[PDB]
Coordinates of C-alpha atoms and ligand atoms in Angstrom, one line a residue:
X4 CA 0.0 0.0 0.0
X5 CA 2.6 2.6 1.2
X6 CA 4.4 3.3 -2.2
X7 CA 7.4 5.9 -2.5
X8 CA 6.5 9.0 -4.3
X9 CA 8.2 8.9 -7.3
X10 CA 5.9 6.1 -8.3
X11 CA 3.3 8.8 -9.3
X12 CA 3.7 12.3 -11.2
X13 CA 0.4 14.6 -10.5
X14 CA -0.5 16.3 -13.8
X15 CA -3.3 18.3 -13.2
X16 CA -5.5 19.4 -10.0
X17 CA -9.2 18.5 -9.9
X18 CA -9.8 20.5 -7.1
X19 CA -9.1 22.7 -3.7
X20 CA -10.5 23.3 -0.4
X21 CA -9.9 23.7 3.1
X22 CA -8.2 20.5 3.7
X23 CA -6.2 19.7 0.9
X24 CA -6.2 18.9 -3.2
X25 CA -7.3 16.1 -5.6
X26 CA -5.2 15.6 -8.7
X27 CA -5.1 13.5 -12.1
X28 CA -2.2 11.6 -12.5
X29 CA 0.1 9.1 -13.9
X30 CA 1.0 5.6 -11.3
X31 CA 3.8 3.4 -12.6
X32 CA 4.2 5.7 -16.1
X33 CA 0.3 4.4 -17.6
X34 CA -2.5 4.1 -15.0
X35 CA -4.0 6.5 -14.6
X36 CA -5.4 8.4 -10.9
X37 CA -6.6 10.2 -8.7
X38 CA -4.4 11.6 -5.9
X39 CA -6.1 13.5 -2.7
X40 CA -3.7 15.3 -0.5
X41 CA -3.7 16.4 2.9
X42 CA -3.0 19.6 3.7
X43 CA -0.8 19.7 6.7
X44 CA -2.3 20.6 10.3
X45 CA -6.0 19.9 8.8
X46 CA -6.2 16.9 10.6
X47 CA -3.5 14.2 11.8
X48 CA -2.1 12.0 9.4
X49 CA -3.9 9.4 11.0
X50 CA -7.1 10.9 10.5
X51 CA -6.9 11.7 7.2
X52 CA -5.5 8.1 6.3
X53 CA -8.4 6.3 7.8
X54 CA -10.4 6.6 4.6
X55 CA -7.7 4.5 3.0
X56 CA -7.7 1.9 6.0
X57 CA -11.8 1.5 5.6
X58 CA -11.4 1.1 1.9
X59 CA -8.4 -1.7 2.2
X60 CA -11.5 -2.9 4.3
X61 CA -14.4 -2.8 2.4
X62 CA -13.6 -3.7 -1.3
X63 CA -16.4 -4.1 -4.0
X64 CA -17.1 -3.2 -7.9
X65 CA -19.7 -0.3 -6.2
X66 CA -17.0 1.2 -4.3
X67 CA -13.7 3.2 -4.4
X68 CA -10.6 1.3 -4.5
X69 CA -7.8 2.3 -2.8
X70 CA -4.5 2.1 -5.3
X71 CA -2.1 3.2 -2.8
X72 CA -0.6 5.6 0.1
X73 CA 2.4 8.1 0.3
X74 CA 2.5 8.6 4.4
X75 CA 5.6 11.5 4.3
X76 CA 4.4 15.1 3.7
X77 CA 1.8 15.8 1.8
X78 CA 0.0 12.8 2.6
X79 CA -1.2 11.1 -0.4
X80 CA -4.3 8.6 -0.8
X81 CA -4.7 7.1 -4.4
X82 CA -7.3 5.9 -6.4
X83 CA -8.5 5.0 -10.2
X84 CA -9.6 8.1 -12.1
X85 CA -13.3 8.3 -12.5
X86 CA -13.8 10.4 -16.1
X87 CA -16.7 12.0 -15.1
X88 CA -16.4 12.9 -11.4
X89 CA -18.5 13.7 -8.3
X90 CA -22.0 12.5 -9.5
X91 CA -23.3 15.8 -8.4
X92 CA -21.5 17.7 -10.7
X93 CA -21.9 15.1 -13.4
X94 CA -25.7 15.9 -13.2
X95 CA -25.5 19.4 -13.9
X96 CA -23.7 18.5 -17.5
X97 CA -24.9 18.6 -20.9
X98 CA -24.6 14.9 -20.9
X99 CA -26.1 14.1 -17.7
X100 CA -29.2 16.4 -18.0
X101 CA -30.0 14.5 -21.3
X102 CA -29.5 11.3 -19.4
X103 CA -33.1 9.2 -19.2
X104 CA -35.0 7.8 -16.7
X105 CA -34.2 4.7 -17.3
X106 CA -30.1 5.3 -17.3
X107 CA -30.5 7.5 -14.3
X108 CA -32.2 4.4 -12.4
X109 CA -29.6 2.2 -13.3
X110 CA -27.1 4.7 -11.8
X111 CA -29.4 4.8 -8.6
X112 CA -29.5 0.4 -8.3
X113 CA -25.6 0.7 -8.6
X114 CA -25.6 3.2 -5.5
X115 CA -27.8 0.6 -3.8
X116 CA -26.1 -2.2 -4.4
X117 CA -22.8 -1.0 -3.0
X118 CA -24.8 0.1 0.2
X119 CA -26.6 -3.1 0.3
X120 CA -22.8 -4.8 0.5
X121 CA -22.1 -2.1 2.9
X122 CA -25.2 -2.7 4.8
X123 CA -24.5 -6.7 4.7
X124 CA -21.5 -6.1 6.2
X125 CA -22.2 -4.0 9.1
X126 CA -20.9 -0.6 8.5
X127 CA -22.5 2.4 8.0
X128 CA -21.9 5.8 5.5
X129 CA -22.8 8.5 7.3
X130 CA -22.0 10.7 4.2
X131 CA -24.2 9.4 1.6
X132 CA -25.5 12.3 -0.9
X133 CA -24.4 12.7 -4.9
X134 CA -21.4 14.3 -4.3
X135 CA -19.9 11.4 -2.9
X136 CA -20.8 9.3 -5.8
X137 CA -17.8 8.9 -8.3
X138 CA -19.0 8.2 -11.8
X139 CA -16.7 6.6 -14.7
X140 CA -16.8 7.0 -19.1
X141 CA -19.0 4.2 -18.9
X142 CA -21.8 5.9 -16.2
X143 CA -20.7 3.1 -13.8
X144 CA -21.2 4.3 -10.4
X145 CA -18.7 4.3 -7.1
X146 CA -19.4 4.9 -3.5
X147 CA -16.8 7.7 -1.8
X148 CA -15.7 8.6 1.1
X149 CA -17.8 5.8 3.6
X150 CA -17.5 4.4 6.7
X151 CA -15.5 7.6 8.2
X152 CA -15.5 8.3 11.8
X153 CA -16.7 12.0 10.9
X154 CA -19.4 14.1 8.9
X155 CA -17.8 15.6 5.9
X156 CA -18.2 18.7 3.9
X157 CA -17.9 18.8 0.1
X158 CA -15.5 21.9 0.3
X159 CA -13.0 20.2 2.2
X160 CA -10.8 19.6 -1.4
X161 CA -12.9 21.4 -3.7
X162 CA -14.3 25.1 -4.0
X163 CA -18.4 25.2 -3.5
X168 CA -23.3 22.3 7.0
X169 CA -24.8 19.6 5.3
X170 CA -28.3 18.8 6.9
X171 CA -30.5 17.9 4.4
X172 CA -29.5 14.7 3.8
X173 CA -29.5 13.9 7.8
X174 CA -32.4 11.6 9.2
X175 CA -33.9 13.1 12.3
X176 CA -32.5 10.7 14.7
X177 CA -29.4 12.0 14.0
X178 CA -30.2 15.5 14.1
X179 CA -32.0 15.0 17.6
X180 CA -29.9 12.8 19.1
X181 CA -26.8 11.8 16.9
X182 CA -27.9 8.4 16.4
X183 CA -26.4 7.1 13.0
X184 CA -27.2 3.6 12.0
X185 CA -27.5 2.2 8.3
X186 CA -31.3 3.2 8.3
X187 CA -30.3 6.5 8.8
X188 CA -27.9 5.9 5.3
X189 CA -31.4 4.5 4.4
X190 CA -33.1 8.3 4.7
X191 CA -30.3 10.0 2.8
X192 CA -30.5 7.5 0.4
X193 CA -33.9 8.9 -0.2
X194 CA -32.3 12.6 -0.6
X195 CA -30.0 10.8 -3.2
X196 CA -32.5 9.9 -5.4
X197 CA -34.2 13.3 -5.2
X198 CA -30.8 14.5 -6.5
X199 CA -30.3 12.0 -9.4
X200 CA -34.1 13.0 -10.9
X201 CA -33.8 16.1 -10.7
X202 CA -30.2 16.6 -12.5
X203 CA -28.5 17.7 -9.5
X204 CA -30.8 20.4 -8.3
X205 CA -30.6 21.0 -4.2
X206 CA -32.8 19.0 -2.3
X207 CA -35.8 20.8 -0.2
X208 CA -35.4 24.0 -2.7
X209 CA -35.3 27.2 -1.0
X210 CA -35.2 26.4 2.5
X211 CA -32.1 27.1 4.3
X212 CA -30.9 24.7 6.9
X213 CA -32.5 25.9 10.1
X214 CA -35.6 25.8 7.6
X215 CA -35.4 22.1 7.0
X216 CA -35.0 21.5 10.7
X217 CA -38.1 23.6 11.5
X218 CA -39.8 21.9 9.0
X219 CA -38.7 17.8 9.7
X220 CA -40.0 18.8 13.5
X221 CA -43.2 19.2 12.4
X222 CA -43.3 15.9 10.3
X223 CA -42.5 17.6 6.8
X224 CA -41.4 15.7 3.4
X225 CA -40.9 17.1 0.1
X226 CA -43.4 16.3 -2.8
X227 CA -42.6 14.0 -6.1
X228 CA -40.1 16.4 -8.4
X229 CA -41.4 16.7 -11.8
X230 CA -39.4 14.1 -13.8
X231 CA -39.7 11.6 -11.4
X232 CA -42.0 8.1 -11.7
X233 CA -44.8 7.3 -8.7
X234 CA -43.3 4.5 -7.9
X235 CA -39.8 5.7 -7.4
X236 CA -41.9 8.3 -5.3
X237 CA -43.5 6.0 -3.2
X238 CA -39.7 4.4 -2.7
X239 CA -38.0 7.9 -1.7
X240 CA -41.6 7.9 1.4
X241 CA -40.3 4.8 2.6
X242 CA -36.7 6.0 2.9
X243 CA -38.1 8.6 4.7
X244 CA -40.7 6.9 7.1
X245 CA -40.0 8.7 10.4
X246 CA -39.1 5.5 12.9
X247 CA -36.1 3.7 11.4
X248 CA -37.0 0.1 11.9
X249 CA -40.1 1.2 9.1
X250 CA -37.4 2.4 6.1
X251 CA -36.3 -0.3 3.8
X252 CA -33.2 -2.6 4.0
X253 CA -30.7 -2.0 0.7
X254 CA -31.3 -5.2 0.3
X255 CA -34.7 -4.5 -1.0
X256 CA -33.8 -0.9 -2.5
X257 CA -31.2 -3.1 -5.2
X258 CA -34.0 -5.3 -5.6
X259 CA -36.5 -2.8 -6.8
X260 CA -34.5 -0.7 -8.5
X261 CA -32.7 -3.3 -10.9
X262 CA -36.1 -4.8 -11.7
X263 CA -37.7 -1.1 -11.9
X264 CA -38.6 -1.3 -16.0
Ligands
7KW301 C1 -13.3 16.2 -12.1 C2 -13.2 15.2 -13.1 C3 -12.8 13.9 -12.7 C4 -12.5 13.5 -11.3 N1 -12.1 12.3 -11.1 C5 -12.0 11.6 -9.9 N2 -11.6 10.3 -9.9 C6 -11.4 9.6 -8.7 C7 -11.6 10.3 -7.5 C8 -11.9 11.7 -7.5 C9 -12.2 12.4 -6.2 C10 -12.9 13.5 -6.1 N3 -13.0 13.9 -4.8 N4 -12.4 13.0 -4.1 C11 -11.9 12.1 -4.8 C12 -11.0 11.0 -4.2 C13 -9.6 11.0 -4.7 C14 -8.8 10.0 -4.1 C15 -9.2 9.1 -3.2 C16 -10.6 9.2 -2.7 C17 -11.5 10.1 -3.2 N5 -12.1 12.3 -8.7 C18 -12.7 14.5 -10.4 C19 -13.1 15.8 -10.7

């Protein structure tokens, strides 16, 4: 895992935020990368390499691979390049706001199925919304950033607190369990109809809170089937035990045409 440096030339940055950089790059002269570096006194080395230790963990064709590690200043964690990015972003694109309901689905079963390994295996997300979604040339879709000991923001190594994908356990009381990856989930999928767009549109934060206290959900988006409606209500059902495993969410979504 730990490789020496010179193994990999960065070529161009991707992004930059408060904790550090992404980059494309070269590993051993062809493969291509991606390379996220720590900025020093963010966070502890061994903070910041925990996200590599959970992948080495958790391996699966739905989720982000770890290539490698460079552990001397800056830290390095490596992975394969995804061509079209952070799901999120991919949305907003020409090409993905001519996607059709039918390819947008299959992105959405792929999501699933690497929670429902996820879920099978007892961990948890935590930080499951589009913009930690990777997505290849082919539209094949990878699950970022999971298991992590801490709520992330997406600004952290890219220019842009997250609450609307949270279930209202955890707001109340910080439980986090997988039905609780189950409700944002639910968020997700509001995201990958509506090409990107924000979810609970024009609310602010304290808004949404407000709001979820007194029982609130949003309504169908425009381009989005009844059924896959009826899916997003039962990710959000307000007593956990009542949401759907990812078991079932694959399930239905792989058989949805
Ligand atoms: C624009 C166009 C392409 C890409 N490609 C890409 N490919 C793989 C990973 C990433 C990426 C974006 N944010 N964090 C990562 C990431 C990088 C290394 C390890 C773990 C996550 N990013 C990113 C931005």
């Amino acid at each position: 895992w730990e490789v020496p440096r010179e193994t990999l030339k960065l070529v161009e940055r991707l992004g930059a935020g408060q904790f550090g950089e992404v980059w494309m790059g070269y590993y051993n002269g062809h493969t291509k990368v991606a390379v996220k570096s720590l900025k020093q006194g963010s966070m502890s080395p061994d903070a910041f390499l925990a996200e590599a230790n959970l992948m080495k963990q958790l391996q699966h064709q739905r989720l982000v691979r770890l290539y490698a590690v460079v552990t001397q200043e800056p830290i390095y964690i490596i992975t394969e390049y995804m061509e079209n990015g952070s799901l999120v972003d991919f949305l907003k694109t020409p090409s993905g706001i001519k996607l059709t309901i039918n390819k947008l689905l299959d992105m959405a079963a792929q999501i699933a199925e690497g929670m429902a390994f996820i879920e099978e295996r007892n961990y948890i997300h935590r930080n499951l919304r589009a913009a930690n979604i990777l997505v290849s040339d082919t539209l094949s879709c990878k699950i970022a950033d999971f298991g992590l000991a801490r709520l992330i923001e997406d600004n952290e190594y890219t220019a842009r607190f997250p609450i609307k994908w949270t279930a209202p356990e955890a707001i109340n009381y910080g439980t986090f369990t997988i039905k609780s990856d189950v409700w944002s989930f639910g968020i997700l999928l509001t995201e990958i109809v509506t090409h990107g767009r924000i979810p609970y549109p024009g609310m602010t934060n304290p808004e949404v809170i407000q709001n979820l206290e007194r029982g609130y959900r949003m309504v169908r988006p425009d381009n989005c089937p009844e059924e896959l409606y009826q899916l997003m209500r039962l990710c959000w059902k307000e007593r956990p035990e009542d949401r759907p495993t990812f078991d079932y969410l694959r399930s239905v979504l792989e058989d949805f045409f």
